[PDB]
Design a protein around this ligand. Structure first.
Ligand SMILES: NC(=O)CCn1cnc2ccccc21
Ligand SMILES: NC(=O)CCn1cnc2ccccc21
Lengths: 264, 265
């Protein structure tokens, strides 16, 4: 992969692997989400964040995901080459935004798009903080100055408020636990694992007859390595669903989300 | 990737990804196992397979793994390029063997090796069968004729008999269930998921202070999508060795047995 000519965005190509595909022989949404995070990590490395600055490190500050929104028009097939372009933008003191565009390498056609909201958090106390000028200035030289959005349309799905699913849930998958393969290099549960857990409570019939078109996921709290999760889903409708991930015992909310599925 | 000049083996390069590494910033054994299976699949495609012959498809026959043996000397770091060479060999009527060699692309040094035993099975009845001549002839033109082994040594670890772990287990991890990401394109649990399940019952202290050098895993029975698994481990041993058992949570039906050898960091 490489930064583009202006140095304000990053592109990378991926050949879809045999173990990365589902029953349709196309990439799963978890494979896509792993590639989005891989291209984000390579962008941070390419510009010297080897994604915290020296100022953030001295104050024990990290960027954490608050929201992830992905829209797929066509999933790449096993053996296909997909090209992903990524860039970041400041959202004032609220935090930052990372956007992505996915294209079929052979046709140049946009096959997907994603956006994510990141907030600054103290790694030890877990307390959220607003973005200061000293930090903003250090990142702004790596972002386009004019707005550049993967989801520019007015009243789009990436900025919609998500309600809390009320008991009883129509569907559920309980006792979900992370294994070592679900943890990142810092021993925290990978963000993509939560997408998988959300999808576990969708009935197999919907998965067999529909394709996932849109997923919006809010991250409220992290799941620890020794935590147990319950995945809850209710049909709200194309089929639309409301989702809730919560700790198995006390019922503490870890995530909330929505999915939209198209008939095959 | 590509077949080599003689067309009897296949090579491929991989750049290690950020989500593929563990706490030491190096590839996990599950990432290595996924790459071994990816290079095996690309080898089958490059020579016209999909990895059944037309004769096997007529009889509803498939190749299934009976044993997997992996030895890692050095795990590749995040951002490193690893080169993997793979080839197959017939083992008469018992089945076939797929071997692999892993190298650091920059130094050319062998950083790992693996071997696996495959048997022919009817897809529907799940009954094993010996390799017939008609089938053997169809894949022998894709294999080296002189023996070529990743583990040539006389008393190597890849051919050792594995005993059944006796209750009580020293360690255990109970209630393990596969999710959709653990299934392959045919909705069967991926072979690599069983390696992860075996490793789940190793204490975190061993993982934090040791590196996995060798893993030998026997595949006895398949875990269904709605099955629940119990992972059991007992220390058998500067090096720590363990005996492993995966069994169904209810009836205690054996799905896998294995051994691991770990060295101090
Ligand atoms: N959302 C993020 O990836 C936060 C870190 N970050 C903010 N602006 C950036 C520009 C380039 C690389 C990482 C950047
Ligand atoms: N061990 C296997 O991968 C079984 C299938 N198979 C047998 N001989 C082969 C030669 C090349 C590719 C796949 C082959």
């Amino acid at each position: 992969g490489s930064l583009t000519e202006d140095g304000l965005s990053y592109k990378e190509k991926f050949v879809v692997r045999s173990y990365e595909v589902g029953s349709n022989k196309t990439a799963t949404v978890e494979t896509i989400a792993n590639l989005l995070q891989e291209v984000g990590c390579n962008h941070a490395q390419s510009v010297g964040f080897s994604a915290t600055t020296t100022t953030m490190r001295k104050l024990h500050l990290i960027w954490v995901t608050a929201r992830m929104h992905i829209e797929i028009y066509k999933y790449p097939a096993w053996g296909d080459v997909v090209e992903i372009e990524t860039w970041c933008q400041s959202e004032g003191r609220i935090g930052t935004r990372r956007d992505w565009i996915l294209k079929d390498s052979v046709t140049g056609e946009v096959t997907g798009r994603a956006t994510s909201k990141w907030v600054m958090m103290n790694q030890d106390t877990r307390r959220l903080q607003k973005v200061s000028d000293d930090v903003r200035d250090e990142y702004l030289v790596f972002c386009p100055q004019e707005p550049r959005l993967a989801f520019p349309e007015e009243n789009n799905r990436s900025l919609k408020k998500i309600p809390k699913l009320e008991d009883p849930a129509q569907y559920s998958m309980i006792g979900l636990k992370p294994r070592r393969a679900d943890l990142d290099m810092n021993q925290h549960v990978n963000n993509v694992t939560y997408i998988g857990w959300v999808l576990e409570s969708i009935p197999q019939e919907i998965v067999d007859t529909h394709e996932l078109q849109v997923i919006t996921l809010d991250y409220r709290r992290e799941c620890q390595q020794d935590d147990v999760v319950d995945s809850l889903t209710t049909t709200t409708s194309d089929s639309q669903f409301l989702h809730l991930l919560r700790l198995s015992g006390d019922g503490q909310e870890i995530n909330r989300g929505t999915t939209l599925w198209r008939k095959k």
